[PDB]
Amino acid sequence: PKNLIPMPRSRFLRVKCIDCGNEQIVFSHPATPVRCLVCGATLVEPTGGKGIIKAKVLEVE
Amino acid sequence: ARIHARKRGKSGSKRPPRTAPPAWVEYTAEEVEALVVKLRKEGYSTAMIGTILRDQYGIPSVKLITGKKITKILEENGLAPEIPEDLMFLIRRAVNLRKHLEQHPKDKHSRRGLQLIESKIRRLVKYYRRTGKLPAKWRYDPEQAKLLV
Amino acid sequence: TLLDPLANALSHITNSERVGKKEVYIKPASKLIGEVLRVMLENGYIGEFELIDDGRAGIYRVQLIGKINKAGAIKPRFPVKARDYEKWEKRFLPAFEFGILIVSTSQGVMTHKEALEKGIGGRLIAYVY
Amino acid sequence: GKKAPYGEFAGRKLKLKRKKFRWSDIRYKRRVLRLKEKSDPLEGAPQARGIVLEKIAVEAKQPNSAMRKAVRVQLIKNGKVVTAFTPGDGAINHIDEHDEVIIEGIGGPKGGSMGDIPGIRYKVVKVNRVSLKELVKGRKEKP
Amino acid sequence: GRTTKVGSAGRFGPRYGLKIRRRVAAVEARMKQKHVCPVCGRKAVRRISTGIWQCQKCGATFAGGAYLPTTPAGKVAKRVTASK
Amino acid sequence: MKRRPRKWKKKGRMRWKWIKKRIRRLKRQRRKERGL
RNA sequence: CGCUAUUAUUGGGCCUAAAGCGUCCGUAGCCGGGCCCGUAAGUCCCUGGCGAAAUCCCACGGCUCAACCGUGGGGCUUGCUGGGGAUACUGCGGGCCUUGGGACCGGGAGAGGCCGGGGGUACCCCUGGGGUAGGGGUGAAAUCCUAUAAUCCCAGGGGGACCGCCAGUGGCGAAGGCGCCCGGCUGGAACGGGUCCGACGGUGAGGGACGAAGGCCAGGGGAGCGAACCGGAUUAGAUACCCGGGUAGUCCUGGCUGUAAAGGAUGCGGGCUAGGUGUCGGGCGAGCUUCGAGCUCGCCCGGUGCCGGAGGGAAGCCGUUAAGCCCGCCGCC
RNA sequence: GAGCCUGGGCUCCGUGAGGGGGGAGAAGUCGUAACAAGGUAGCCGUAGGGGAACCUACGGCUCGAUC
Ligand SMILES: [Zn+2]
Ligand SMILES: [Zn+2]
């Protein structure tokens, strides 16, 4: 068949913070800065389009 | 197309046909509601609440997880705005423009923007009167609107 | 903007048939469109229409076989009595029994032949030949 | 663009549109406002009586060349003066001044003049209650 | 304001002509309104005499034009002397 | 004025702008003649 | 009356033949996305009371047949009204949805607009130094400037307008229109978005706002150009074309005028009917890299061009940026 | 409450010494504006001028030919 049902190109990620080893679910195309809930450090800087990841990706949901 | 500019842009969201929430969602409804209330108390709007839940907590389509919307969650408490948010954003834009134009009379290209903003406000007023979210005699007037913001 | 989706469905079918397509997609679905496709299939103008579920509305996938010359919606939806079908036949069709006039009644959507058997009238919506 | 209006509940505007754009036709305008009646010296009649004043001759239009004989006629209905053509060969000889004359239309596009002689609209039918055709053919004698 | 075309020149009726009445009305309508003070910044400046202007609130008293507190040459002199 | 764009063609005709200029002078004279 | 689809509901036209308001905002009106429940106003069926006769259609009968007259069956009277039944469509009332539309966040593009500050050459005049007889202009000449020292070169002072090449087949804007650099205030659009609202929409008579040049009013300024005008030439004549001068105006501040081949000579919204090759913006993915906000290739969205099959058209031509097939609204012939 | 007089309101026709442009008809006189790059490319808007077609200036369009 055809691609008539529009499906998203973005995905959710399970990343791990280097400092404290906390695992966290986050969005791939963010519009705000994403911070470690525990430490407070930034894991994903926002851009136009896809965001830059500053952590280790474990799973891509 | 755009109501004024008539340009056929398509830069929106592509949501999938979900009915049930996914399994990899950690939080539950009772936590999501508290998160909403807290982010509201810290002065955020509904759109930003949703954006933050999505980006930082991994909560897609709050309505899926909690069977109701954000404005419903906030009305169930004493936190919902008296004037809808679109109207207030537009009214703030209009107030700021009138301030600018009092100092810049002959700009003459932002007065048209002011006209367009007021047309949008009038459309929304006509809608909200019918739906009942405003009294049926509510009128926009910049004089009295200076105090709303 | 979008005012009438049945008209668009029928015009799309007409053009695709004119230029020789096998399948066609009708994006905003509706029960009127479903019933009209049912009547067309019963009378042998199409084959094997299916409904697909995207979270917005229904989509209709229709197969074509090479039997439609012209298909169109009737606007305005004129009311018609049981003793006045000949005028509209002569106005919309090319021969005394050639094609179908689709009528909405209080008993359902049907062809004018069945509606005449039952002895009732209704509203004209579509024609096919 | 599609032709408007076309909706089921839009008959008022249709009727107004047709009424408006019908005034651009000259037939309807003239018939309704009654202009021919206001500008006609025969006052809506197919014939009329008159009294002669002067014989004359009109030069034909190019590329033809000839002199058509005509006569100025004063009408008894209203006193207005018109010009009438005398058909036939020698017709102008069987007409003197102060003779009574019956006038008809000459026959032309839009109830007007004919080909070679523009400016004239009427022709003579009778002279002192006798047919000019009979006069010309010699089957009669005028009193 | 009962009049459509005439203003302060309605005082002397159909006399003296159109151009002259228009000019008088224009000048007087520009003059008699209130003006901004160069000291306090409020619209309270009126004329006292030919060339002498006074604010009512602060009491500022300055010299200026005959029918308006400023002149073009005055503006240009102010600018040029401020720069150089 | 309301202008017919056919008039601007030059075939059997004098130039439309000059014709318009000639028309605006005659109006001037006629109204003066009445004295209104 | 028809002919006449030259009044077009059926059933007409608006690039060039008559015809799209200069552009936009919006009032009435007309047209309005999908699902569920109810009502039964519109709508359909059945039955009661009315819509005089003559006139119209058919059959039979009487004057020889017929025209005519009589008997009976239908129709006409553009329809009104009393009840019963139905609920697909429209309307009315109440809930739900997110595709159309609006709001918000992010990183970027752009001569979009206003204000202030700083400059760049060139042109005109004035003051000094040098030099000496022509300069300017034309098809050819003359008026004109010049020994009170011109044209030309050098050093300085002042003034007014405009912003070259880069510059594009480019961009922003509703149109008109917008090009030196820096800073502040401000309008809109595209892209990306499991963000928010939940049909809030289209068009728009009447009304309103903006709107090249030119002209008018009031006040300032005025280098160059230049209607009017003054001269010199050409010419049979020259109220013109060419040459030398030159007022209003062209600039700024505040108003009026509301007009253009204000032209894509093509009104606006939505859906469908092969594509190819260029270029601007954003995004994704591959490769190179002097590691640069860098270069090449492909794909998605949006703008902006050139070709072209089917198709359309009187043709010229148009041809997914239709002048093709459908759903709407205004203006005009 | 007729009729008479009287003062006004509206509107169609009636008649008038004499002036202005318009249209046909003969084609008479002065020039040569337009069609070719028509011999100064043409046309729109505004303003000034001229025996006449027309000239000039600012802004615009190509329905403009050539290298
Ligand atoms: Zn951490
Ligand atoms: Zn003061």
UniProtKB/Swiss-Prot annotation, chain B:
Belongs to the universal ribosomal protein uS15 family. InterPro entries: Ribosomal_uS15, Ribosomal_uS15_arc_euk, Ribosomal_uS15_N, uS15_NS1_RNA-bd_sf. It comes from the Archaea. Residues 1-17 have a biased composition (Basic residues). One of its GO terms (cellular component) is cytosolic small ribosomal subunit. This is Small ribosomal subunit protein uS15. PROSITE patterns: RIBOSOMAL_S15. The keyword Ribonucleoprotein applies.
UniProtKB/Swiss-Prot annotation, chain C:
One of its GO terms (cellular component) is cytosolic small ribosomal subunit. This is Small ribosomal subunit protein uS8. One of the primary rRNA binding proteins, it binds directly to 16S rRNA central domain where it helps coordinate assembly of the platform of the 30S subunit. Keywords: Ribonucleoprotein, Ribosomal protein, RNA-binding, rRNA-binding. Part of the 30S ribosomal subunit. GO terms for biological process: translation. InterPro entries: Ribosomal_uS8, Ribosomal_uS8_CS, Ribosomal_uS8_sf. GO terms for molecular function: rRNA binding; structural constituent of ribosome. It comes from the Archaea. It holds the Pfam family Ribosomal_S8. Coiled coil: none annotated. Belongs to the universal ribosomal protein uS8 family.
Swiss-Prot record, chain D:
The keyword Cell wall biogenesis/degradation does not apply. InterPro entries: NA-bd_OB-fold (IPR012340), Ribosomal_uS12 (IPR006032), Ribosomal_uS12_arc (IPR022863), Ribosomal_uS12_bac (IPR005679), Ribosomal_uS12_euk/arc (IPR005680). Keywords: Ribonucleoprotein, Ribosomal protein, RNA-binding, rRNA-binding. One of its GO terms (cellular component) is cytosolic small ribosomal subunit. Transmembrane segments: none annotated. Gene3D superfamilies: Nucleic acid-binding proteins. SUPFAM superfamilies: Nucleic acid-binding proteins. PROSITE patterns: RIBOSOMAL_S12 (PS00055). GO terms for molecular function: rRNA binding; structural constituent of ribosome. One of its GO terms (biological process) is translation. With S4 and S5 plays an important role in translational accuracy. Located at the interface of the 30S and 50S subunits. Part of the 30S ribosomal subunit. Belongs to the universal ribosomal protein uS12 family. This is Small ribosomal subunit protein uS12. It comes from Thermococcus kodakarensis (strain ATCC BAA-918 / JCM 12380 / KOD1) (Pyrococcus kodakaraensis (strain KOD1)).
Curated annotation (Swiss-Prot), chain E:
It holds the Pfam family Ribosomal_L37ae. It comes from the Archaea. A zinc finger (C4-type) spans 37-58. One of its GO terms (cellular component) is ribosome. Binds 1 zinc ion per subunit. Zn(2+) binds at residues 37, 40, 55, 58. The keyword Ribosomal protein applies. One of its GO terms (molecular function) is structural constituent of ribosome. The keyword Repeat does not apply. One of its GO terms (biological process) is translation. Its cofactor is Zn(2+). Keywords: Metal-binding, Ribonucleoprotein, Ribosomal protein, RNA-binding, Zinc, Zinc-finger. Part of the 50S ribosomal subunit. Belongs to the eukaryotic ribosomal protein eL43 family. This is Large ribosomal subunit protein eL43.
